[PDB]
Amino acid sequence: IVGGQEAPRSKWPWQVSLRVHGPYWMHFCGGSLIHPQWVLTAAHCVGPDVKDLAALRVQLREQHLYYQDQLLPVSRIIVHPQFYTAQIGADIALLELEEPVKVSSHVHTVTLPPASETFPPGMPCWVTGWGDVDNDERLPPPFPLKQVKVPIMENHICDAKYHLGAYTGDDVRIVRDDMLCAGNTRRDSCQGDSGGPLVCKVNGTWLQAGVVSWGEGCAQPNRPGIYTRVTYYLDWIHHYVPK
Amino acid sequence: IVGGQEAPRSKWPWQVSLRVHGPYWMHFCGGSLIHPQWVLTAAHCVGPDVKDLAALRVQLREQHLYYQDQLLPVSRIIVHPQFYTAQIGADIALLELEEPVKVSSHVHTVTLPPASETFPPGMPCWVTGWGDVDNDERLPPPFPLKQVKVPIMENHICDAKYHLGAYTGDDVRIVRDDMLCAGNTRRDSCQGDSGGPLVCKVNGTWLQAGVVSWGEGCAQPNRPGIYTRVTYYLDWIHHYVPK
Amino acid sequence: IVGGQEAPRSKWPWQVSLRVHGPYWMHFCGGSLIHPQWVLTAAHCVGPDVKDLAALRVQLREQHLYYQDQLLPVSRIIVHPQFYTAQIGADIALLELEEPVKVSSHVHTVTLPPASETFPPGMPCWVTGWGDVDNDERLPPPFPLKQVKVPIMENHICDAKYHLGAYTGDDVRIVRDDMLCAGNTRRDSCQGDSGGPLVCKVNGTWLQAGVVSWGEGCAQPNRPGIYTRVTYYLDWIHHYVPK
Amino acid sequence: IVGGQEAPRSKWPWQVSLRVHGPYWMHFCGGSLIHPQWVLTAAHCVGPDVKDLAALRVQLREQHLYYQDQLLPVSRIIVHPQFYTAQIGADIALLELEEPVKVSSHVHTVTLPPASETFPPGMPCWVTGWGDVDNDERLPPPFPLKQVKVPIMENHICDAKYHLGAYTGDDVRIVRDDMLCAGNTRRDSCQGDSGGPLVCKVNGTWLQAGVVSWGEGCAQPNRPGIYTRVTYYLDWIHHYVPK
Ligand SMILES: C[Si](C)(O[Si](C)(C)c1coc2ccc(C(=O)N3CCC(c4cccc(CN)c4)CC3)cc12)c1coc2ccc(C(=O)N3CCC(c4cccc(CN)c4)CC3)cc12
Ligand SMILES: C[Si](C)(O[Si](C)(C)c1coc2ccc(C(=O)N3CCC(c4cccc(CN)c4)CC3)cc12)c1coc2ccc(C(=O)N3CCC(c4cccc(CN)c4)CC3)cc12
Ligand SMILES: [Cl-]
Ligand SMILES: [Cl-]
Ligand SMILES: [Cl-]
Ligand SMILES: [Cl-]
């Protein structure tokens, strides 16, 4: 997270951390608890090439990474079959937990938006994670969960910004219709935040609008953060996750 | 270049090296001389973002990098407007030199293929360059130009390989129709070879079939190297370079 | 620490961590609390060149680095004037804290040895710290304090080992008389453990025999760890620290 | 070499490069041809631990490293038996070549000084090598041999300078009697120049005064380059090398 601060312990009860087996169970990507037995994340965290399930675990909301880990095994990785790279799109994946989590006020699910939900330009949303704090700047120990408030950007404007200072033809889409943009040169998600949630409070209810997907660096001029648009893939999500 | 060997001095008179300004004028991609005032390279080497032309120079065929440099400045960088990433396609670009080069038996242009040549499996083709000699292994000093003979794999077969060990659906195309596949687990191009030539001997004449573009690593199982298919982009090239 | 295990919370109440200011207050050496206002460490951790005192802080016994830091600033750095490198000797230094620490069962001083204790082979001795767990392997998060029991090797025997596989003449002393050897190819201190304590239980009391100083790598054949012999430097220490 | 320039091809016919076996025969240290069958170098380049002779070769004077290598095998490494580290001293070694070199005006021996030779403070001398061009700045390709003119410094002054900004007692020697100092904040030897020659023209004859040994960084305030004093070790040298 670039330009944020450390999150209050009471906030973001759905945030998860994805961990890969090595010398330790290291954080590589974020995710969100969308049902007691399912995590929503980015396909590029876990694909497109097939991964060993035994080398992956999930960690539920933690103030500080690694300090009080209680690692959860995963029973299935479901990567959207249209995914090959984040720039092409379909950057979305599900992880089915081995058990349902017992929900509490401290760890619980996020609400998905209705199909019709339009998160309008300017709407204040929040992105969270334990990613880098700037380009090539790691989150320092003790690895607090960070948050930053970022406004939704309209696709057409976000696409136009990506074309400024580029050779790419103006009518050739960079930011595609299954993607959503947020952030500026002071506030953004960054590497390690991938797969985590962009959430917006709509009439007082928190809805997950996006999944951290990609961008050109973090907080760079004319290069807002790009997210997979959750509304776009609701039907695919609902094919596996109970409503 | 993975596999193969140091090129004889008499071969590949069209090979160029692209250099970026820093503590020294460092090699970062290859290219080919297609006209005395024009170099053909990969878009990903010089885009999609606009770079400072003053910080780019070209070196004509050299047996060893850096030893006998005579760097040439560039007046224009022209990048295919469809280009955004190598995995999407249109990985092709042109550099106009500030002056025409004087040609000779040692340094001269390569012939572009007619629109109809398809470069089928079994054709004798070579890829050349100063890139890495295996995944994450640098070409050692004194940096000789390398060459390797690479076998063509038909696009549909190549695409099908790219789907083995992938989540990507089998009918979601990975290797696109403007690309070409060649190489195996002993013979391939690698990082630093990008933008250079794949040339095939057709009826006694060397034609440039491909521009080194991408792949999943270098010389990995089921993952041939991918080239930009030059025939696909002949009309574009001819918008800029005289016939 | 190579080998051994995470220390129980009740053990080594004297262990400290030295921190250098940067993107975070990073652990770079250990130390020991020898008086409420004084820490004993290795000279090589803080010298021979004079450093900015404002950029140094000390953390008292913590089970996990960084998680619950309460950093304490330093008023004086006193380095043995014979010191230039660890291989020459006099690898010993004192830090005066700006305030006295409040002691308890969890955090308190270690007892210095009488001038006459020699710490012979067979004595039960432990070395503790947050350093590397093998040559060039970092202690992973969450950075637990480690301990390992290390066997003492008599100085002359240790010196003779240091000469095996060396050009150095056998009568040119390597392990000097102000040093002490301990450890083997399974149990040793390592980088990041420097400046911390080697403690040996003598007649029911824990005494600090050694300060972690140097060695040829960590847990390597014929190369025990080398410590600064605390008894050699008692008079110096007592020039500064009250009895 | 810090602050130098590329050497004329006619200069320094005694300079050699020491090469270690890996992915290529990489330069690690300098040396000097002091007899047709012997190279003078620093012991820290090849010790104090015993090295495999088969993994070492010598390269005679070359304008550019790696370009025209003709690598020479070594038949004996002789490391001064008093050597353990450069800061202690005796940082001097001999390599006996498998054959005598055939001398020419382009490659030939350097003259050693007489025992009595005093290279006085201020005398202009030259150091040469293919080392780093500043702290942590590698010599760029095509790796030219560099030179820089450096004045001799008196030991007592050099020792005093090393004490400025240090905790080390003023009467505790840092720069020892077998060492010689030269250089300033604009001109110095650096890592990779080790073992190469410091040469001074005395009444029109070039004599080797020093062997590049160590220092605190390169070209740092109050930290001149330190060399092994060749006069000090003449008798040891003459024990193996014919006069
Ligand atoms: C994940 Si990749 C490594 O991405 Si790119 C550097 C190619 C990339 C393409 O578009 C981009 C657009 C942006 C960024 C970028 O700036 N990022 C940093 C910031 C980050 C980020 C993350 C989270 C949030 C935010 C928002 N602020 C940003 C997103 C990535 C990176 C990119 C990649 C995608 O598909 C691939 C397919 C293959 C490979 C691959 O294996 N290689 C590349 C090709 C190479 C090769 C070279 C020559 C010849 C051959 C033939 N043998 C091979 C071998 C190694 C790599 C990839
Ligand atoms: C200890 Si240092 C960093 O030197 Si060494 C790595 C060659 C060393 C000398 O003896 C040793 C003996 C052992 C080890 C070693 O193996 N270690 C790894 C393990 C570690 C350790 C730590 C804790 C516990 C244990 C026990 N298991 C071990 C101790 C170090 C290392 C060494 C050193 C001491 O005094 C110095 C003074 C100066 C410098 C220094 O600044 N430089 C070296 C010289 C160099 C230079 C080169 C050519 C010309 C010039 C002139 N401009 C300069 C510039 C950079 C470095 C040092
Ligand atoms: Cl919340
Ligand atoms: Cl040819
Ligand atoms: Cl204890
Ligand atoms: Cl000369």
Centre of ligand 2 from the C-alpha of residue C65, in Å:
27
Q: How far is CA B171 from CA A43, A83, A110, B160, C98, in A?
A: 18, 12, 33, 9, 70
Contact C175, C202 (CB under 8 A): no
Residue type, D33: L
Query: Who contacts B69 (Cβ-Cβ below 8 Å, separation ≥6)?
Result: B25, B59, B62, D142
SS3 track for chain C: CECCEECCCCCCCCEEEEEECCCCCEEEEEEEEEECCEEEECHHHHCCECCCHHHEEEECCCCECCCCCCCEEEEEEEECCCCCCCCCCCCCEEEEECCCCCCCCCCCCCECCCCCCCCCCCCCEEEEECCCCECCECCCCCCECEEEECCEECHHHHHHHHHCCECCCCCCCCCCCCEEEECCCCCECCCCCCCCEEEEEECCEEEEEEEEEECCCCCECCECEEEEEHHHHHHHHHHHCCC
Whether residue A121 has its Cβ less than 6 Å from ligand 1 = no
Centre of ligand 3 from the C-alpha of residue A123, in Å:
16
Contact C200, C111 (CB under 8 A): no
- Inspect the interface and report whether the beta carbons of C140 and A64 lie closer than 8 Å: no
Contact A160, A135 (CB under 8 A): no
Pocket test for ligand 1, best of B168, B194, B216 (most atoms within 8 A of CB): B216
H-helix or E-strand containing D154?
A: none
Closest ligand 1 atom, residue B44 Cα: 7
- Inspect the interface and report whether the beta carbons of A81 and B172 lie closer than 8 Å: yes
Please provide residue A95's backbone torsions phi and psi, each rounded to the nearest 5 degrees.
Answer: -120, 125
Residue type, A44: H
Gap between the Cα atoms of D110 and D104, Å rounded:
12
Contact A42, A92 (CB under 8 A): yes
Contact C230, C210 (CB under 8 A): yes
Contact D71, D126 (CB under 8 A): no
- Inspect the interface and report whether the beta carbons of C174 and D43 lie closer than 8 Å: no
Gap between the Cα atoms of B147 and B150, Å rounded:
9
Q: Closest Cα to residue D16, out of D51, D41, D37, D45?
A: D41
Chains D and B, touching by 3 or more CB pairs within 8 angstroms: yes
Q: Closest Cα to residue C112, out of C30, C31, C34, C211?
A: C34
Residue found under tokens 């790598």: C217
Q: Closest Cα to residue C178, out of C239, C89, C117?
A: C89
Query: Who contacts A54 (Cβ-Cβ below 8 Å, separation ≥6)?
Result: A21
Residues of C in contact with A24 (CB under 8 A): 140-141
The SS3 of residue B81 is: coil
Residues of B in contact with A48 (CB under 8 A): 166-168
Contact B1, B129 (CB under 8 A): yes
H-helix or E-strand containing D46?
A: helix D43-46
Gap between the Cα atoms of C136 and C113, Å rounded:
33
- On whether any CB of chain C is under 8 Å from the CB of D49, the answer is yes
SS3 track for chain A: CECCEECCCCCCCCEEEEEECCCCCEEEEEEEEEECCEEEECHHHHCCECCCHHHEEEECCCCECCCCCCCEEEEEEEECCCCCCCCCCCCCEEEEECCCCCCCCCCCCCECCCCCCCCCCCCEEEEEECCCCECCECCCCCCECEEEEEEEECHHHHHHHHHCCECCCCCCCCCCCCEEEECCCCCECCCCCCCCEEEEEECCEEEEEEEEEECCCCCECCECEEEEEHHHHHHHHHHHCCC
Q: Which one of A19, A67, A143 would you mutate to disrupt binding with C, by most C Cβ within 10 Å of its Cβ?
A: A67
- C13-109+232-243, what's its fold? Thrombin, subunit H (2.40.10)
Q: Closest Cα to residue A113, out of A36, A224, A198, A54?
A: A198
Gap between the Cα atoms of B5 and B10, Å rounded:
14
Chains D and A, touching by 3 or more CB pairs within 8 angstroms: no
- Inspect the interface and report whether the beta carbons of A141 and C65 lie closer than 8 Å: yes
- On whether any CB of chain D is under 8 Å from the CB of C84, the answer is yes
- On whether any CB of chain B is under 8 Å from the CB of D142, the answer is yes
- Sheet with strand B225-229: strands edge to edge: B5-6, B146-149, B125-129, B197-202, B205-214, B225-229, B179-182, B152-153
Residue type, C122: G
Contact B160, B174 (CB under 8 A): no
Contact B141, D66 (CB under 8 A): yes
Whether residue B218 has its Cβ less than 6 Å from ligand 1 = yes
- Number of Cβ atoms within 10 Å of the Cβ of A161: 18
H-type helices in B119-200, by residue range?
A: 155-163
Q: Mind telling me how many Å the CA of A138 is from chain B's nearest CA? A: 23
Method: X-ray
Are the folds of C1-12+110-231 and C13-109+232-243 the same?
yes
Cis amide prior to C48 (ω within 30 degrees): yes
- Inspect the interface and report whether the beta carbons of B168 and A82 lie closer than 8 Å: yes
Pairs of residues, one from chain A and one from chain C, whose beta carbons lie less than 8 Å apart:
25
Gap between the Cα atoms of C35 and C50, Å rounded:
23
Q: Closest Cα to residue A229, out of A167, A153, A173?
A: A153
Burial tier of D130 (Cβ tally within 10 Å: 0-12, 13-18, 19+): buried
Residues of C in contact with A65 (CB under 8 A): 141
- Sheet with strand C179-182: strands edge to edge: C5-6, C146-149, C125-129, C197-202, C205-214, C225-229, C179-182, C152-153
Burial tier of B11 (Cβ tally within 10 Å: 0-12, 13-18, 19+): middle
Residue found under tokens 């993975």: B2
Q: Mind telling me how many Å the CA of C137 is from chain A's nearest CA? A: 9
Whether residue B231 has its Cβ less than 6 Å from ligand 1 = no
C194 is catalytic: yes
Burial tier of C52 (Cβ tally within 10 Å: 0-12, 13-18, 19+): exposed
Q: Which residue of B has its CA nearest to D137?
A: B23
Closest ligand 1 atom, residue A44 Cα: 1
- On whether any CB of chain B is under 8 Å from the CB of A120, the answer is no
Contact A209, A180 (CB under 8 A): yes
Q: Which residue of B has its CA nearest to D69?
A: B142
Chains A and B, touching by 3 or more CB pairs within 8 angstroms: yes
Residue nearest to atom 14 of ligand 2 (CA): C216
Residue found under tokens 């390989």: B161
Residue nearest to atom 5 of ligand 2 (CA): D85
Gap between the Cα atoms of A180 and A214, Å rounded:
11
Q: Closest Cα to residue D40, out of D12, D66, D14, D11?
A: D14
Rg value, chain C, Cα: 17
- Inspect the interface and report whether the beta carbons of C23 and A142 lie closer than 8 Å: no
Query: Who contacts A127 (Cβ-Cβ below 8 Å, separation ≥6)?
Result: A1, A147, A148, A150, A182, A183, A189, A193, A196, A197, A198, A199, A210, A212, A225
- Inspect the interface and report whether the beta carbons of A24 and C66 lie closer than 8 Å: no
Q: Mind telling me how many Å the CA of B110 is from chain A's nearest CA? A: 26
Gap between the Cα atoms of A138 and A161, Å rounded:
27
Which residues surround the ion ligand 6 when the cut-off is CB under 5 Å? D 11
- Inspect the interface and report whether the beta carbons of D88 and C87 lie closer than 8 Å: yes
Nearest ligand (C-alpha, residue C224)? 2
How close are the terminal C-alpha atoms of chain B, in Å?
A: 31
Candidate from C67, C138, C140 with C-beta closest to A142: C67
Token pair of B159 as six digits = 């695409």
List the domain boundaries for chain C. Answer: 1-12+110-231, 13-109+232-243
Residues of C in contact with A137 (CB under 8 A): 23
Contact A47, A79 (CB under 8 A): yes
Pocket test for ligand 1, best of A158, A214, A220 (most atoms within 8 A of CB): A214
Please provide residue A157's backbone torsions phi and psi, each rounded to the nearest 5 degrees.
Answer: -70, -40
Gap between the Cα atoms of C31 and C129, Å rounded:
9
Q: Mind telling me how many Å the CA of C170 is from chain D's nearest CA? A: 8
The CATH classification number of B1-12+110-231 equals 2.40.10.10
- Among candidate residues C17, C32, C189, C194, the one labeled active-site is C194
H-helix or E-strand containing D213?
A: strand D205-214
Contact C119, C200 (CB under 8 A): yes
Gap between the Cα atoms of C170 and B108, Å rounded:
66
Helix, strand, coil: what percent of chain D each, to 5?
10, 35, 50
H-helix or E-strand containing D132?
A: none
Q: Closest Cα to residue D224, out of D112, D119, D121, D90?
A: D121
The SS3 of residue B180 is: strand
Nearest ligand (C-alpha, residue A9)? 3
The SS3 of residue B159 is: helix
Gap between the Cα atoms of A16 and A226, Å rounded:
20
Strands C15-20 and C26-35: antiparallel
C91 is catalytic: yes
Gap between the Cα atoms of C203 and C77, Å rounded:
33
Contact C166, D50 (CB under 8 A): yes
Q: Closest Cα to residue A214, out of A122, A116, A86, A82?
A: A86
Gap between the Cα atoms of A76 and A95, Å rounded:
6
Centre of ligand 3 from the C-alpha of residue A11, in Å:
4
Residue nearest to atom 39 of ligand 2 (CA): D216
Contact D142, D67 (CB under 8 A): yes
Calculate the CA dihedral of residues B233, B234, B236, B237 and round it to 10 degrees: 110
Candidate from B24, B138, B142 with C-beta closest to D67: B142
Calculate the CA dihedral of residues A16, A21, A24, A28 and round it to 10 degrees: -40
Contact A183, A189 (CB under 8 A): yes
Candidate from D48, D87, D165 with C-beta closest to C168: D48
Give the start-end residues of each E strand in D7-143: 15-20, 26-35, 38-41, 56-59, 72-79, 93-97, 124-129
Centre of ligand 6 from the C-alpha of residue D13, in Å:
6
Residues of D in contact with C81 (CB under 8 A): 167-169, 172
Q: Closest Cα to residue A162, out of A104, A118, A220?
A: A220
Q: Closest Cα to residue C211, out of C45, C82, C36?
A: C45
Q: Mind telling me how many Å the CA of D220 is from chain C's nearest CA? A: 13
Residues of D with active-site annotation: 44, 91, 194
Residue type, A18: L
Q: Which long-range contacts (CB under 8 A, 24 or more apart) does B64-69 make?
A: B64/B142, B64/B143, B64/B144, B64/B145, B64/D67, B65/B17, B65/B27, B65/B130, B65/B142, B65/B143, B65/D141, B66/B24, B66/B27, B66/B143, B66/D141, B66/D142, B67/B142, B67/D64, B67/D67, B67/D142, B69/B25, B69/D142
Strands D15-20 and D56-59: antiparallel
Q: What does the angle CA D157 – CA D161 – CA D167 come to, to the nearest 5 degrees?
A: 130
Nearest ligand (C-alpha, residue C11)? 5
Token pair of C43 as six digits = 């000279």
Gap between the Cα atoms of A226 and A153, Å rounded:
10
Contact A62, A18 (CB under 8 A): no
Beta bridge partners of C29: C18
Gap between the Cα atoms of D180 and B25, Å rounded:
37
Q: Mind telling me how many Å the CA of C196 is from chain A's nearest CA? A: 22
